[PDB]
Ligand binder design. Structure first.
Ligand SMILES: C[C@H](CCC(=O)NCCC[N+](C)(C)CCCS(=O)(=O)[O-])[C@H]1CC[C@H]2[C@H]3[C@H](O)C[C@@H]4C[C@H](O)CC[C@]4(C)[C@H]3C[C@H](O)[C@]12C
Lengths: 11, 239
Protein backbone atom coordinates (compact mmCIF):
# COMPACT_ATOMS: atom_id res chain seq x y z
CA UNK A 1 0.00 0.00 0.00
CA UNK A 2 2.29 2.75 -1.35
CA UNK A 3 -0.08 5.66 -0.82
CA UNK A 4 -0.53 4.85 2.86
CA UNK A 5 3.23 4.64 3.39
CA UNK A 6 3.59 8.03 1.67
CA UNK A 7 0.97 9.70 3.85
CA UNK A 8 2.72 8.41 6.99
CA UNK A 9 6.23 9.30 5.85
CA UNK A 10 5.89 12.61 4.01
CA UNK A 11 7.28 15.70 5.78
CA UNK B 1 -12.91 13.76 37.49
CA UNK B 2 -10.93 12.95 34.33
CA UNK B 3 -8.17 10.34 33.99
CA UNK B 4 -4.82 11.79 32.97
CA UNK B 5 -4.67 9.31 30.11
CA UNK B 6 -7.93 10.51 28.57
CA UNK B 7 -6.83 14.13 28.83
CA UNK B 8 -3.67 13.16 26.91
CA UNK B 9 -5.67 11.45 24.18
CA UNK B 10 -7.89 14.53 23.91
CA UNK B 11 -4.88 16.80 23.40
CA UNK B 12 -4.35 15.00 20.11
CA UNK B 13 -7.87 15.68 18.76
CA UNK B 14 -7.88 17.36 15.34
CA UNK B 15 -8.56 21.07 14.88
CA UNK B 16 -11.99 20.52 13.37
CA UNK B 17 -12.74 23.97 11.90
CA UNK B 18 -9.31 23.79 10.25
CA UNK B 19 -9.86 20.31 8.79
CA UNK B 20 -13.34 21.31 7.59
CA UNK B 21 -11.99 24.42 5.87
CA UNK B 22 -9.08 22.54 4.33
CA UNK B 23 -11.20 19.76 2.82
CA UNK B 24 -13.87 22.19 1.63
CA UNK B 25 -11.22 24.33 -0.10
CA UNK B 26 -9.62 21.27 -1.72
CA UNK B 27 -12.95 20.04 -3.14
CA UNK B 28 -13.77 23.55 -4.41
CA UNK B 29 -10.42 23.99 -6.15
CA UNK B 30 -10.65 20.50 -7.67
CA UNK B 31 -13.93 21.36 -9.37
CA UNK B 32 -12.55 24.79 -10.29
CA UNK B 33 -9.37 23.41 -11.85
CA UNK B 34 -11.50 21.17 -14.08
CA UNK B 35 -12.75 22.40 -17.46
CA UNK B 36 -16.39 21.93 -18.50
CA UNK B 37 -15.20 18.91 -20.43
CA UNK B 38 -13.94 17.13 -17.28
CA UNK B 39 -16.27 18.01 -14.38
CA UNK B 40 -16.50 15.37 -11.65
CA UNK B 41 -19.61 13.25 -11.11
CA UNK B 42 -21.47 12.97 -7.81
CA UNK B 43 -19.82 9.65 -7.07
CA UNK B 44 -16.53 11.19 -8.20
CA UNK B 45 -16.86 13.97 -5.61
CA UNK B 46 -18.00 11.51 -2.94
CA UNK B 47 -14.82 9.55 -3.62
CA UNK B 48 -12.62 12.64 -3.38
CA UNK B 49 -14.29 13.81 -0.17
CA UNK B 50 -13.86 10.33 1.31
CA UNK B 51 -10.19 10.24 0.34
CA UNK B 52 -9.64 13.62 1.98
CA UNK B 53 -11.48 12.39 5.08
CA UNK B 54 -9.18 9.37 5.30
CA UNK B 55 -6.09 11.54 4.62
CA UNK B 56 -7.11 13.63 7.66
CA UNK B 57 -7.60 10.49 9.77
CA UNK B 58 -4.12 9.32 8.84
CA UNK B 59 -2.77 12.76 9.67
CA UNK B 60 -4.52 12.65 13.04
CA UNK B 61 -3.08 9.21 13.81
CA UNK B 62 0.44 10.11 12.72
CA UNK B 63 0.60 13.00 15.21
CA UNK B 64 -1.16 11.22 18.05
CA UNK B 65 0.25 10.04 21.35
CA UNK B 66 1.45 6.41 21.27
CA UNK B 67 0.86 5.97 17.50
CA UNK B 68 3.65 8.42 16.72
CA UNK B 69 6.13 6.16 18.58
CA UNK B 70 5.57 3.32 16.08
CA UNK B 71 7.71 2.57 13.03
CA UNK B 72 5.92 3.41 9.75
CA UNK B 73 5.53 -0.35 9.01
CA UNK B 74 3.59 -0.81 12.26
CA UNK B 75 1.60 2.36 11.65
CA UNK B 76 0.51 0.95 8.27
CA UNK B 77 -0.47 -2.37 9.83
CA UNK B 78 -2.69 -0.72 12.46
CA UNK B 79 -4.36 1.61 9.94
CA UNK B 80 -4.78 -1.15 7.38
CA UNK B 81 -6.57 -3.10 10.10
CA UNK B 82 -9.14 -0.41 11.01
CA UNK B 83 -9.38 2.28 8.31
CA UNK B 84 -13.05 1.68 7.49
CA UNK B 85 -14.02 1.50 11.15
CA UNK B 86 -12.32 4.83 11.82
CA UNK B 87 -14.15 6.36 8.86
CA UNK B 88 -17.50 5.15 10.22
CA UNK B 89 -16.73 6.10 13.82
CA UNK B 90 -15.65 9.58 12.64
CA UNK B 91 -18.89 9.96 10.67
CA UNK B 92 -21.08 8.73 13.50
CA UNK B 93 -19.51 10.99 16.10
CA UNK B 94 -19.80 13.97 13.73
CA UNK B 95 -23.56 13.30 13.60
CA UNK B 96 -23.81 12.79 17.36
CA UNK B 97 -22.32 16.26 17.96
CA UNK B 98 -23.40 18.23 14.87
CA UNK B 99 -26.29 16.35 13.28
CA UNK B 100 -29.82 17.74 12.94
CA UNK B 101 -32.96 15.70 12.25
CA UNK B 102 -33.36 15.18 8.53
CA UNK B 103 -29.81 16.20 7.75
CA UNK B 104 -26.25 14.92 7.49
CA UNK B 105 -23.34 17.03 8.68
CA UNK B 106 -20.44 16.62 6.27
CA UNK B 107 -16.71 16.62 6.94
CA UNK B 108 -16.63 19.97 5.10
CA UNK B 109 -18.65 21.64 7.85
CA UNK B 110 -21.86 21.79 5.80
CA UNK B 111 -25.31 20.32 6.56
CA UNK B 112 -26.93 18.46 3.64
CA UNK B 113 -30.55 17.40 3.62
CA UNK B 114 -30.75 13.64 4.06
CA UNK B 115 -33.40 13.09 1.41
CA UNK B 116 -31.16 14.81 -1.17
CA UNK B 117 -28.10 12.69 -0.55
CA UNK B 118 -30.22 9.53 -0.17
CA UNK B 119 -31.88 10.24 -3.55
CA UNK B 120 -28.46 10.28 -5.17
CA UNK B 121 -27.04 7.48 -3.05
CA UNK B 122 -29.51 4.73 -3.89
CA UNK B 123 -30.63 1.72 -1.89
CA UNK B 124 -27.30 0.30 -0.70
CA UNK B 125 -25.73 3.52 0.52
CA UNK B 126 -29.05 4.70 1.94
CA UNK B 127 -29.24 1.47 3.94
CA UNK B 128 -25.71 2.09 5.31
CA UNK B 129 -26.47 5.71 6.29
CA UNK B 130 -29.70 4.63 7.97
CA UNK B 131 -27.84 1.97 9.96
CA UNK B 132 -25.30 4.61 10.96
CA UNK B 133 -28.11 6.97 12.02
CA UNK B 134 -29.59 4.31 14.29
CA UNK B 135 -26.20 4.06 15.99
CA UNK B 136 -26.08 7.87 16.29
CA UNK B 137 -29.47 7.80 18.04
CA UNK B 138 -28.32 4.98 20.32
CA UNK B 139 -25.15 6.84 21.24
CA UNK B 140 -27.13 10.02 21.94
CA UNK B 141 -29.46 8.07 24.25
CA UNK B 142 -26.38 6.77 26.07
CA UNK B 143 -25.10 10.35 26.47
CA UNK B 144 -21.94 9.51 24.46
CA UNK B 145 -19.36 12.24 25.02
CA UNK B 146 -16.01 13.21 23.56
CA UNK B 147 -13.97 11.58 26.31
CA UNK B 148 -15.64 8.25 25.53
CA UNK B 149 -15.25 8.88 21.79
CA UNK B 150 -11.49 9.31 21.95
CA UNK B 151 -11.17 6.16 24.07
CA UNK B 152 -13.17 4.13 21.53
CA UNK B 153 -11.07 5.57 18.73
CA UNK B 154 -7.84 4.44 20.37
CA UNK B 155 -9.33 1.00 21.10
CA UNK B 156 -10.28 0.65 17.43
CA UNK B 157 -6.86 1.85 16.30
CA UNK B 158 -4.82 -0.29 18.73
CA UNK B 159 -6.67 -3.52 18.05
CA UNK B 160 -5.56 -6.88 19.43
CA UNK B 161 -6.24 -8.57 16.13
CA UNK B 162 -3.55 -6.69 14.20
CA UNK B 163 -1.18 -9.11 12.51
CA UNK B 164 2.60 -9.20 12.58
CA UNK B 165 3.12 -5.99 14.55
CA UNK B 166 6.68 -5.41 15.77
CA UNK B 167 5.72 -3.35 18.82
CA UNK B 168 2.71 -5.32 19.94
CA UNK B 169 3.51 -4.27 23.50
CA UNK B 170 2.06 -0.83 22.77
CA UNK B 171 -1.19 -2.47 21.63
CA UNK B 172 -1.28 -4.52 24.84
CA UNK B 173 -0.61 -1.45 26.93
CA UNK B 174 -3.01 0.90 25.18
CA UNK B 175 -5.74 -1.73 25.36
CA UNK B 176 -5.23 -2.37 29.05
CA UNK B 177 -4.94 1.27 30.04
CA UNK B 178 -7.59 2.85 27.80
CA UNK B 179 -10.19 0.24 28.80
CA UNK B 180 -9.37 0.90 32.47
CA UNK B 181 -9.55 4.68 32.01
CA UNK B 182 -12.85 4.50 30.11
CA UNK B 183 -14.34 2.39 32.90
CA UNK B 184 -13.09 4.80 35.58
CA UNK B 185 -14.36 7.78 33.60
CA UNK B 186 -17.87 6.41 32.93
CA UNK B 187 -18.29 5.23 36.54
CA UNK B 188 -17.22 8.64 37.87
CA UNK B 189 -19.03 10.89 35.45
CA UNK B 190 -22.13 8.82 34.68
CA UNK B 191 -22.81 7.11 38.02
CA UNK B 192 -26.48 6.86 37.14
CA UNK B 193 -25.70 4.67 34.11
CA UNK B 194 -24.27 1.63 35.89
CA UNK B 195 -23.71 -0.31 32.64
CA UNK B 196 -22.44 2.51 30.43
CA UNK B 197 -18.95 1.10 29.95
CA UNK B 198 -20.19 -2.22 28.54
CA UNK B 199 -22.90 -0.44 26.52
CA UNK B 200 -20.24 1.72 24.81
CA UNK B 201 -18.06 -1.29 23.97
CA UNK B 202 -21.02 -3.12 22.47
CA UNK B 203 -21.24 -0.39 19.83
CA UNK B 204 -17.83 -1.40 18.43
CA UNK B 205 -19.10 -4.58 16.74
CA UNK B 206 -21.90 -2.48 15.31
CA UNK B 207 -19.38 0.03 13.95
CA UNK B 208 -17.52 -2.89 12.41
CA UNK B 209 -20.75 -4.17 10.78
CA UNK B 210 -21.38 -0.78 9.20
CA UNK B 211 -17.74 -0.69 8.03
CA UNK B 212 -18.24 -4.06 6.28
CA UNK B 213 -21.29 -2.60 4.53
CA UNK B 214 -19.12 0.33 3.43
CA UNK B 215 -16.36 -1.90 2.13
CA UNK B 216 -18.94 -3.99 0.25
CA UNK B 217 -20.40 -0.86 -1.39
CA UNK B 218 -16.94 0.32 -2.34
CA UNK B 219 -15.99 -3.08 -3.74
CA UNK B 220 -19.10 -3.27 -5.97
CA UNK B 221 -18.42 0.25 -7.31
CA UNK B 222 -14.92 -0.96 -8.05
CA UNK B 223 -16.21 -4.09 -9.83
CA UNK B 224 -18.27 -1.71 -11.96
CA UNK B 225 -15.23 0.38 -12.89
CA UNK B 226 -16.65 3.39 -11.00
CA UNK B 227 -13.80 4.00 -8.53
CA UNK B 228 -10.86 6.09 -9.81
CA UNK B 229 -7.43 4.50 -9.83
CA UNK B 230 -5.37 5.03 -6.66
CA UNK B 231 -8.33 6.20 -4.63
CA UNK B 232 -6.96 5.57 -1.12
CA UNK B 233 -10.08 3.81 0.10
CA UNK B 234 -9.81 1.26 -2.71
CA UNK B 235 -6.03 1.03 -2.11
CA UNK B 236 -6.80 0.23 1.55
CA UNK B 237 -9.29 -2.39 0.37
CA UNK B 238 -6.82 -3.89 -2.12
CA UNK B 239 -4.94 -4.25 1.15
C1 LIG C 1 -13.68 -11.75 -2.33
C2 LIG C 1 -13.39 -10.32 -2.59
C3 LIG C 1 -11.98 -10.23 -3.09
C4 LIG C 1 -11.81 -10.60 -4.59
C5 LIG C 1 -10.28 -10.59 -4.98
O1 LIG C 1 -9.43 -11.24 -4.42
N1 LIG C 1 -9.78 -9.75 -6.07
C6 LIG C 1 -8.37 -9.75 -6.41
C7 LIG C 1 -8.23 -9.62 -7.94
C8 LIG C 1 -9.18 -10.65 -8.60
N2 LIG C 1 -8.54 -11.59 -9.52
C9 LIG C 1 -8.32 -10.98 -10.80
C10 LIG C 1 -7.27 -12.06 -9.07
C11 LIG C 1 -9.37 -12.78 -9.65
C12 LIG C 1 -10.74 -12.39 -10.26
C13 LIG C 1 -11.84 -11.83 -9.26
S1 LIG C 1 -12.90 -10.74 -10.29
O2 LIG C 1 -13.20 -9.76 -9.18
O3 LIG C 1 -12.13 -9.89 -11.21
O4 LIG C 1 -13.84 -11.63 -10.89
C14 LIG C 1 -13.47 -9.45 -1.32
C15 LIG C 1 -13.44 -7.94 -1.67
C16 LIG C 1 -14.36 -7.15 -0.61
C17 LIG C 1 -14.55 -8.32 0.33
C18 LIG C 1 -15.36 -8.21 1.59
C19 LIG C 1 -15.63 -6.76 1.93
O5 LIG C 1 -14.44 -6.37 2.48
C20 LIG C 1 -16.70 -6.45 2.94
C21 LIG C 1 -17.06 -7.60 3.83
C22 LIG C 1 -15.96 -7.73 4.87
C23 LIG C 1 -16.29 -8.87 5.81
O6 LIG C 1 -15.22 -9.06 6.68
C24 LIG C 1 -16.54 -10.13 5.03
C25 LIG C 1 -17.61 -9.96 3.98
C26 LIG C 1 -17.32 -8.83 3.01
C27 LIG C 1 -18.46 -8.56 2.04
C28 LIG C 1 -16.09 -9.30 2.22
C29 LIG C 1 -16.15 -10.50 1.32
C30 LIG C 1 -14.96 -10.77 0.40
O7 LIG C 1 -13.84 -11.08 1.13
C31 LIG C 1 -14.56 -9.59 -0.39
C32 LIG C 1 -15.80 -9.49 -1.31
Amino acid sequence: NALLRYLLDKD
Amino acid sequence: SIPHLILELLKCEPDEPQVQAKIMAYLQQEQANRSKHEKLSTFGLMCKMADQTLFSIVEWARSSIFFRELKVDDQMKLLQNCWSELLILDHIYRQVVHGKEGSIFLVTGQQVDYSIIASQAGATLNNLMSHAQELVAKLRSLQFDQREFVCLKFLVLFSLDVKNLENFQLVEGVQEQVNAALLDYTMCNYPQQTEKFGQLLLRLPEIRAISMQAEEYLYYKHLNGDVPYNNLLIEMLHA
